[PDB]
């Protein structure tokens, strides 16, 4: 009933920390995100993940980064984790130069496209807006 | 024999679909602050859904916005966990 965690490594953890954006996108600086990325790095490092932080990635860089990760050999890893810190809209996340669908970033890790992560947990943490509605709350 | 190709994913979103996600420039985004806090204390002894459920609670209760733009004043946030996991997940043993 539990995922088998008896592997030589917990797994790879990719943090994509997007702070600065091309003026073309209209998006402002995401102040505070460096503190997020450092705090996350420590936590996931403490869990046992092999963490690498990438900064101000273009859409193409993000696509390539996840594609390359999905093509590595995860045979001796228990799981995989990816953390996305950026602007966004529903189903999409911002690179420095525009937007890219979240589905396309994560599709690389499908069972038929990443055999060495088959039957292993694939975790994605996403800090990003998903629309423009605000929650006023109650009580 | 076979396993669905979409099986064993988990998405931990900072907010629900259609909604905004908030960030304090001095301290960082609400979701990450809460996520790290819960992971720091319970990352090794709680199942991941227990962890993220507690993160949900922390974001929902410990945070409320302040802005001089009244459109963004006293707003709230709830994260959103999407699980296609087929087993319980512990980060130990």
């Amino acid at each position: 009933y539990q995922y088998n965690m008896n592997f030589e490594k917990l797994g790879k953890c990719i943090i994509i920390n997007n702070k600065n954006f091309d003026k073309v996108t209209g998006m402002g600086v995401r102040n505070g995100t460096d503190k997020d990325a450092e705090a996350l790095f420590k936590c996931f490092r403490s869990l046992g993940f092999d963490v690498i932080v990438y900064n101000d990635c273009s859409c193409a860089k993000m696509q390539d980064l996840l594609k390359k990760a999905s093509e590595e050999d995860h045979t001796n890893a228990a799981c995989f984790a990816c953390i996305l810190l950026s602007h966004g809209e529903e189903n999409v996340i911002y690179g420095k130069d525009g937007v890219t669908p979240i589905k396309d970033l994560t599709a690389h890790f499908r069972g038929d496209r990443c055999k060495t992560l088959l039957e292993k947990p694939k975790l994605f943490f996403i800090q990003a807006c998903r629309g423009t509605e605000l929650d006023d709350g109650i009580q | 024999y076979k396993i669905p190709v979409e099986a064993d994913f988990l998405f931990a979103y900072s907010t629900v679909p259609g909604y905004v996600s908030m960030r304090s420039p001095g301290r960082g985004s609400w979701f990450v602050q809460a996520l790290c806090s819960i992971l720091e204390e319970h990352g090794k002894d709680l199942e991941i859904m227990q962890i993220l459920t507690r993160v949900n609670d922390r974001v929902a209760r410990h945070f409320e916005s302040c802005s001089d733009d009244p459109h963004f004043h006293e707003k709230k946030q709830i994260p959103c966990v999407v699980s296609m996991l087929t087993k319980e997940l512990y980060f130990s043993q």
Partner: peptide
């Protein structure tokens, strides 16, 4: 507070 800021918006993502």
């Amino acid at each position: 507070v800021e918006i993502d």
